[PDB]
Curated annotation (Swiss-Prot), chain A:
Superkingdom in the source lineage: Bacteria
Role summary: Required to facilitate the formation of correct disulfide bonds in some periplasmic proteins and for the assembly of the periplasmic c-type cytochromes. Acts by transferring electrons from cytoplasmic thioredoxin to the periplasm, thereby maintaining the active site of DsbC, DsbE and DsbG in a reduced state. This transfer involves a cascade of disulfide bond formation and reduction steps.
Impact noted for substituting residue 34 to A: Loss of activity
Organism: Escherichia coli (strain K12)
Residue numbers of the full-length protein present here: 447 to 564 of 565
Name of the protein in its database record: Thiol:disulfide interchange protein DsbD
Localization per Swiss-Prot or TrEMBL: Cell inner membrane
Sequence ranges assigned to domain Thioredoxin in this UniProt record: 1-118
Family indicated by similarity: Belongs to the thioredoxin family. DsbD subfamily.
Amino acid sequence: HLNFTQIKTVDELNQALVEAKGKPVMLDLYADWCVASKEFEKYTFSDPQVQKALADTVLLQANVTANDAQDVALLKHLNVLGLPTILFFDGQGQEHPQARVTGFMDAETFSAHLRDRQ
Amino acid sequence: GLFDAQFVPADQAFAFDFQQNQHDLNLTWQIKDGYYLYRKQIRITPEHAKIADVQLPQGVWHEDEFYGKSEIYRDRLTLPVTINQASAGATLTVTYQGSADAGFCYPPETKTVPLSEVVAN
């Protein structure tokens, strides 16, 4: 069970971002009603390898299940179209948009993609 | 190998549109192949108008290990609405939600349909 550190707002995100100065960060946008989002938790973030690859990565996670104002705000700010969507910021706080994962992805593929930051 | 290298925007996945002719309104969604709408998520709410109860058509069944079965719509969705009365500036609030087969969930969408005035009878 990867241990994410929940965030709810755009500020909480930037806050967590400054904290993780120097480490690579991953943001996972999740929602209970989203099956794909559930499949991601059950079959990928659970995989040994995947967890190994994320060992030195700061784990952030926004649960947008309520789809409230704050939620919509955060999604709009990150230009997120739907879930599951996963973002990556280099250890210098820079997000790599072309690297985000949209939709379900199996552990083998995810782990690979994760280890391309070398 | 490159860390920096599929799903279309919601309005491109579910192309919404409507057409009215007096008491007759037609709600319509062009549903992109590979995507589908959740029947249980559609909501039609009138604002300054009186609408006849709307009957949702029979769609297909989708399944997944979590919620089991769910009625969904593919290709296209046509929803006939009967407008008994509508004041000037009356509107129809339409909410729906869909997902993609490849495993992608779009959040709920709400469109406001401008209804044309329609008197009692």
